[PDB]
């Protein structure tokens, strides 16, 4: 009742008399559904339990255990001049092979 007439106060109209009707749901085993001044508030087991269950369902869908988590981002190589002076023409081939191994191996 308290929630009912308080919702009736929150409406733009309150001067109109209020008539209350109570009915039975086989779908709802806990809680109530109340409509006043074309404003409905649903606090039911079918709705509340599914609302809390939806969080679990969404969280389960988000995760991908099968997948591998992404590694930290890698910066540019910036190879030193001493490396390059030792191996002039080879570092390009070795970087290409490194990409190949990072993908396949």
């Amino acid at each position: 009742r308290k929630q009912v007439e308080e919702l009736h106060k929150e409406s733009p109209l309150k001067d109109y008399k209020l008539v209350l009707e109570t009915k039975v749901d086989p779908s709802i085993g806990g809680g109530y559904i109340l409509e006043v001044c074309n404003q409905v508030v649903n606090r039911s087991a079918a709705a509340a339990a599914a609302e809390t269950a939806a969080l679990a369902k969404a969280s389960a869908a988000q995760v991908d255990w099968t997948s591998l988590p992404a590694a930290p981002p890698r910066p540019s190589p910036s190879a030193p001049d001493t490396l390059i002076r030792l191996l002039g023409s080879v570092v390009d081939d070795l970087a290409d092979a490194d990409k190949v191994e990072q993908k396949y191996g």
Binding site: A60, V63, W65, T66, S67, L68, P69
Partner: protein, 57 residues
């Protein structure tokens, strides 16, 4: 639910994205078959080159 996924990966019933291979470090970072995973920890190149596995498990 995840422990179930782990068990399915160990049995080999499920596969990984971009054909990722199963390894202990791999698995650890995601999170008889177990002994094979223990072998998988050790470097493959080291084992083959040094013939460590040739003697036996």
């Amino acid at each position: 639910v995840k422990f179930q996924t782990l068990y399915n990966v160990l049995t080999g019933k499920q596969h990984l994205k971009d054909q990722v291979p199963v390894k202990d470090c791999n698995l650890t970072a995601i999170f008889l078959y177990l002994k094979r995973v223990d072998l998988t920890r050790y470097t493959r190149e080291e084992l083959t080159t040094y013939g460590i596995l040739a003697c036996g498990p």
